[PDB]
Ligand binder design. Structure first.
Ligand SMILES: O=C(O)[C@H](Cc1ccccc1)Oc1ccc(Cl)cc1
Lengths: 270, 270
């Protein structure tokens, strides 16, 4: 029954709304310089960074940064806080995925471990446009050009994501689509270490079935979007890859940089 | 019209058969399958290979192991020769895909330059089984165990493909299926350097449609198969990547020699 698949489609979209405070809808409303019910403060240079804390919730330093964790450090030390924020949110979303919690407790931890970052960059796309990304729950907007100018080892930490996002937003997907897509990325099954893969692939077929019907109904005139979407899962993989090696490089250049525990566990080698 | 998709499917199948000597139906019969009437020459040990590179229709170097060239090197160089062969077969194949020859010459070359590898490891999976891969038009069978006992740099060269193949073969696809899959791969619109992505994506959109129908009809019980195959293109990618990784390492082994100029010339980087 296709009626059963729409139900699951609605269920996941519902938890999607409940677990992510900043949807793609809100993001675009904020990004398109029209709905000015509340516009973002822009960050495109150090001077703006200063003023940044002024009208934005920033527990970081406001004045000089050179002799006190420079802009680069400040920004990514904050970038960590959000990354964990995202994990916890996704972890919560994951629990609402039918069958997920019923899987082996180990397998839950393995699916989260490998999927939590592919989803982050997917959604991160919702907060981006060719020129920059939304920060502090849509309250701010940091320029891509600013981010690319950061210190030699931090400057190329985001660029590869902007590129991912520009072509991925082209698909023009929305939250109800993402909800199912994000639920397909978790219930994969080819993740390294999974014990019982069959019970997992049984859920993904279900989710995949849901995502398909969803895409057809929701984008009738968009030929093979389903396949075009699924192929994007590869683009994600690569990105996670370049990220970790970039992370492995920081760990050596900044002996004082502290990677948060939760993120340390998730990440491994090879 | 289901008439055009079936027409392309067939057309592609026919061109696949006429382009590839060893089909999967064939390889499969020679492999774990029975169909005994000309058993292949197994290669499981240094004596097995030695006593084979002389009794087999191989064209490169004769078996000699006594302070005169290594076993692993001669085996690696074997893949090159054969791959280069494959590359010519695939190019002749791509040329029969509706639209391909009409693309911008530079675009054609580009699509091939990056698709050949993914295609190679895909089709290799046909010749592979859990315990080894067919060698020499199917005249032989080099074991997987012997490949892993190879030199330090080479003992981890085919294991990642063995792992890929085993998971890939589970899909239980057949030549008629791979004819279309392969076409989808070459018609990749994200290949770096392309000049006019529109036409290339147009043909792939069409191919992807054909694959989808071909699958539903060819495997009515295999659920959501179309989706699972498209997800294997991610593994291919990582295989293809990781492959170039163990290549540079090799590049830091055998190099400077005035006799390779013309031989090494025939083998670029693909
Ligand atoms: O490595 C990670 O898991 C996060 C992921 C992330 C990146 C950008 C926005 C949100 C999360 O990126 C980081 C990159 C560098 C640091 Cl010093 C900390 C985190």
């Amino acid at each position: 029954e296709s009626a059963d698949l729409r139900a699951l489609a609605k269920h996941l979209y519902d938890s999607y709304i409940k677990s992510f405070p900043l949807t793609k809808a809100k993001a675009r409303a904020i990004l398109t310089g029209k709905t000015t019910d509340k516009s973002p403060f822009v960050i495109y240079d150090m001077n703006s960074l200063m003023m940044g804390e002024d009208k934005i919730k920033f527990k970081h330093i406001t004045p000089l940064q050179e002799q006190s964790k420079e802009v680069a450090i400040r920004i990514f030390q904050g970038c960590q806080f959000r990354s964990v924020e995202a994990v916890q949110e996704i972890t919560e979303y994951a629990k609402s995925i039918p069958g997920f919690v019923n899987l082996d407790l180990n397998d839950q931890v393995t699916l989260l471990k490998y999927g939590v970052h592919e989803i982050i960059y997917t959604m991160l796309a919702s907060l981006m446009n060719k020129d920059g990304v939304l920060i502090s729950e849509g309250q701010g907007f940091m320029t891509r050009e600013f981010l690319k100018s950061l210190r030699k080892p931090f400057g190329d930490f985001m660029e590869p994501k902007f590129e991912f996002a520009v072509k991925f937003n082209a698909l023009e997907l929305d939250d109800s689509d993402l909800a199912i897509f994000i639920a397909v990325i978790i219930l994969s099954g080819d993740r390294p270490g999974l014990l019982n893969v069959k019970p997992i692939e049984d859920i993904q077929d279900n989710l995949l079935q849901a995502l398909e019907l969803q895409l057809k109904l929701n984008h009738p005139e968009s030929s093979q979007l389903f396949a075009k979407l699924l192929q994007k899962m590869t683009d994600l993989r690569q990105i996670v890859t370049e990220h970790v090696q970039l992370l492995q490089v920081i760990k050596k250049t900044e002996t004082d940089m502290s990677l948060h525990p939760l993120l340390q566990e998730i990440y491994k080698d090879l």
